């Protein structure tokens, strides 16, 4: 039934046919039916690279026929006339089953490829309907790109049977696998939404779909912040990757020691961290792990950073400041009283302390020094080390045993932190090398064993000194062009929050000057 | 008129004086000098140390008598009746001048022997006056340690006269130089507060007499102000001087980098850090500017800091605080815009420039870093060189000769900044080889000249390097043991307000470890 310029113009449009093209049809002794195997033959003869057949005994609609390449079965079906305004639509999965190349967003179509779940689609037309094509050929279009969607587009003036069965009340009405799918005007990109619950995981991809950074900050506590805060200032284009925004600063409450600020709260000064970046074009990028740095191979290079969620981002400089973590006895009641007089960090909650007993864990030098500084504020201090001596540089020792307030226990090893329900009241230890159980009275535990930089991820990478800090320079360099550490998982001597957004301002500035003074076109 | 027990009691006293004492009469015929008459010589009688001896031809009251050394006509005068309640007053005028000691602060006695005006006391009495004696003995006193404050005491018994004449109406009542001072009890403490305006200057004696401070903090800036909180929270005694508080925070308006805090303004962050020291146990010091350190010639010696107002501060530990200043141009009209477009910091206010055109002046690394940096976000920079050409590292012209909104101006002399009254329009400036004049319109003009740290006063005491910072470890360690600093003053890279807040407490946990590390009993 095509007239003189479909036939014409549909010879051109053929002679883009790079692959064969076989058009198989299903049908009966209906007149439609007739006037559908004459319209295979009248384009069969259009070119050679179209033959047309028959396969009467076949699951599927009478009058029907399948757009193939030779030897498959995968490629959209019509069922009726697939003239009317679905003429261009014909057309076009011809062309696309022999090779010409669809209009459309390339990435789109990769996506549709690879997808897993089965599909049967089944779209109802008219002739008369001028808005059924777009539809039509975004469903054939998934046919050919993917054999686990199947297509056919259903002409209603065949099977006006049909349409009442289901209760078609108007077109282009679409089905997936039996199931209402929706009608009217869909574009491709919104079926390609509906249909794939798809992989959660790309912010993934999208990470890795993102544009190169100028700088790239790994650690979002108060020094990743900080550096966000400089580097977007100077307008270039700045990513701040982390964990969690707020780090430490998180899983405290009261702050004493943030300069200027006489008194706030973690959760505040986290916040409000938060919307200090939040001023400026900064990417901010929650919940992603860094698990390692590839440095660049070449002076104008770029730094890369893979996650643990598998993805890569890029940057031309790069500055990490994943902070560190304190170390826990990891006893009963610990958990219980963190903030309620079990602490990390004589400075930050030393005052705090004024008139009580306190306990210091740990004999190295970071819980000896933490005692003399309490002796100098508390009522009392006791000193519990583990191992049948202490650490700590003898120059500290002394000075600790010189004083009259505090009480050293060796070999002590803490069981049970008590409190009433509210704070801390006391402490349990063991004698390790009797067994015995021991009790004291105090309202704070300082908690002194240990540092912990998280920067194992970093092995190889970057230098680290021998307790696991970043080795940096003044200016916040380390041992790699264009990478920059800032704040407590550097060697920087102490661990504050008003010290670490210092590094972190001028780690940025750094790495800022880093940017101008490379590049030579 | 002298009793058996003030006779008895009186000899006893008399055994304590290690210098000869006369007493000088004048005297008419009346009954009461032949009473006084009398009375002395029943003294001079009671030890050979006492003399008594007349002169009856001078200008002083009859009767009346001087108690001095041999050859002076220094010390207190009695006319009247020295008995009654006055008798022990009597007795310590002959005592303080044969060299028994005052029972009074000694300090208050070395301050009225140094004291330049004249002065001619005399106080009324009546033997009855219970209260009388304090305030006789208070000014005796005086006339002894210093020959310039003359003292009469007047017994009203005799001179029933003189009391109507200058209407006296109750007693004790004292006169300074013909002026009445004062009646009723007052102490020598008072006596000498009212009497000598005195030195102004002690703060400076005063500062002088102060404790030896645990660690003394020199200038109270950003950096200053941190250091002085983290270091009174453990306790231990601190001193924060300098000749402003805020430092270079109180002439800038608006700050956008102070992180956590969106916008403040300089006089509230001063005003800020100000509470913010007051809820700590400092000796803040304001309006005192160091002009040496005197490092400790020992280990555990004390550091010395001398102050153009003549004062010696001592401390265990101290820390540098001083800052810097930025060079100006010195031109008309680069003090009328100050904060309205006329900068001194791009990091600081370059954002504040979107869209506008502004100029830098100076051709070194930190102009044309400074241009490089505004150039990415300002519609164009234009750079003005002094000299024939610039003093940058290479890397850095070749980098801002790249840019195609900047122009680079050489032998460029600013001579004026043009504003609309209310913010910057334009410059001008002279071709320094021609002479010739030029302008150029624009909004903002950043000086990169140069920085000048505050430390030409330590020349000789800690290790400069060839800018004038003070050399500083990551501990913020100068070359002089329990000497540090921080923030502009030092070698820190970048001159920011929460880096110099960072310095700070860096600063102060060193000077604390430093404290506790050396003492060795
Ligand atoms: C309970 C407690 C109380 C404290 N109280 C005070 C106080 O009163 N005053 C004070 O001055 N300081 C206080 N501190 C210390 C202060 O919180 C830290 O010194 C400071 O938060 C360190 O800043 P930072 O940004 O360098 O590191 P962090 O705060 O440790 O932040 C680093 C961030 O990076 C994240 N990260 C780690 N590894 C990775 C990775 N591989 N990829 C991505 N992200 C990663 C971490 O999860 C964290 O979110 C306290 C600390 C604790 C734990
Ligand atoms: C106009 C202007 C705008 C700025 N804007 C910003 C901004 O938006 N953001 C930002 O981060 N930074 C900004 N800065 C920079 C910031 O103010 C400084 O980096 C910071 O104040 C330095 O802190 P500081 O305590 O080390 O030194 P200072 O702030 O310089 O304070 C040092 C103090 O010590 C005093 N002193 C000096 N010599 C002596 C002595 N011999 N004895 C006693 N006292 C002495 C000084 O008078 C001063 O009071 C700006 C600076 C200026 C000038
Ligand atoms: N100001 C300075 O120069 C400082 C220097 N340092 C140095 O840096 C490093 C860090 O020192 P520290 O943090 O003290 O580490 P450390 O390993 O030297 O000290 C840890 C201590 O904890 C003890 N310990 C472990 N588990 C315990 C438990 N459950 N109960 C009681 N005690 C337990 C160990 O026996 C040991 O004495 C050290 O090598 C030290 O020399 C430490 C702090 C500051
Ligand atoms: N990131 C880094 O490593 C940085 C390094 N530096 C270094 O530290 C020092 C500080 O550098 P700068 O502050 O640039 O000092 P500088 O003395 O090198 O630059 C000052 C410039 O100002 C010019 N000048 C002086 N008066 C002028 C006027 N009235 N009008 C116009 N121009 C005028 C001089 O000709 C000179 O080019 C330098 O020695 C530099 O090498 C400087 C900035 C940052």
Chains 1, 2 share one sequence.
């Not at 049908?27 to 007739?34: G, P, V």
């Not at 309620?340 to 007993?357: A, E, I, N, Q, S």
């Not at 998280?454 to 800090?469: C, I, K, S, Y």
Request: net charge negative; hydrophobic share 40%.
């Amino acid at each position: 039934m095509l007239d003189t310029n479909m036939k014409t113009q549909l010879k051109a449009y053929l002679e883009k046919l790079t692959k064969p093209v076989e058009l198989i049809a299903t049908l009966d002794d209906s007149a439609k039916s007739a006037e559908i195997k004459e319209l295979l033959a009248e384009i069969a003869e259009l070119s050679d690279k179209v033959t047309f057949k028959e396969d009467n005994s076949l699951p599927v609609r009478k009058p029907s026929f399948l757009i193939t390449n030779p030897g498959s079965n995968q490629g959209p079906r019509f069922a009726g006339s697939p003239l009317g305004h679905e003429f261009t639509s014909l057309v076009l999965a011809l062309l696309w089953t022999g090779g010409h190349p669809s209009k459309e967003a390339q990435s789109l179509l990769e996506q549709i490829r690879h997808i897993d779940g089965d599909f049967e689609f089944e779209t109802y037309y008219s002739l008369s309907c001028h808005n059924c094509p777009d539809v039509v050929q975004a469903l054939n279009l998934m046919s050919v790109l993917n054999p686990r969607i199947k297509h056919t587009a259903i002409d209603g003036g065949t099977f006006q049977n049909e349409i009442t069965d289901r209760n078609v009340m108007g077109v282009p009405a679409v089905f997936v696998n039996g199931k209402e799918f929706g009608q009217g005007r869909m574009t491709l990109t919104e079926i390609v939404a509906k249909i794939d619950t798809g992989a959660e995981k790309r912010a993934a991809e999208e990470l890795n779909k993102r544009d190169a950074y100028d700088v790239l900050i790994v650690g979002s506590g108060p020094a990743g912040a900080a550096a966000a805060i400089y580097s977007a200032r100077k307008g270039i284009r700045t990513g701040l990757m982390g964990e969690r925004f707020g780090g430490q600063i998180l899983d405290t409450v009261d702050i004493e020691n943030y300069i200027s600020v006489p008194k706030t709260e973690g959760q505040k000064l986290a916040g409000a961290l938060k919307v200090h970046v939040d001023e400026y074009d900064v990417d901010v990028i929650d919940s992603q792990s860094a698990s390692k740095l590839i440095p660049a191979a070449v002076e104008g290079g770029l730094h890369q950073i893979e996650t643990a969620s598998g993805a890569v981002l890029k940057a031309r400089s790069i500055i990490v400041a994943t902070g560190a973590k304190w170390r826990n006895m990891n006893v009963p009641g610990e958990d219980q009283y963190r903030t309620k007089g079990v602490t990390y960090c004589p400075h930050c909650d030393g005052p705090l302390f004024k008139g009580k007993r306190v306990a210091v864990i740990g004999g190295g030098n970071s819980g000896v020094e933490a005692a003399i500084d309490l002796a100098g504020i508390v009522e009392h201090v006791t000193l519990l080390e583990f191992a049948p001596e202490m650490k700590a540089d003898q120059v500290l020792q002394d000075k600790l045993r010189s004083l009259k307030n505090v009480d050293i226990i060796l070999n002590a090893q803490t069981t049970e932190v008590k409190g009433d329900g509210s704070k801390v009241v006391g402490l349990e230890y063991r004698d390790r090398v009797s067994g015995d159980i021991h009790n004291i009275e105090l309202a704070g535990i300082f908690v002194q064993i240990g540092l912990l930089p998280n920067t194992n991820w970093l092995e190889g990478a970057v230098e680290r000194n021998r307790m696991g800090e970043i080795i940096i320079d003044a200016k916040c360099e380390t041992n790699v062009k264009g990478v920059f550490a800032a704040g407590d998982c550097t060697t920087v001597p102490y661990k504050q929050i008003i010290i670490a957004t210092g590094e972190g301002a001028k780690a940025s500035l750094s790495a800022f000057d880093y940017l101008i003074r490379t590049k030579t076109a």
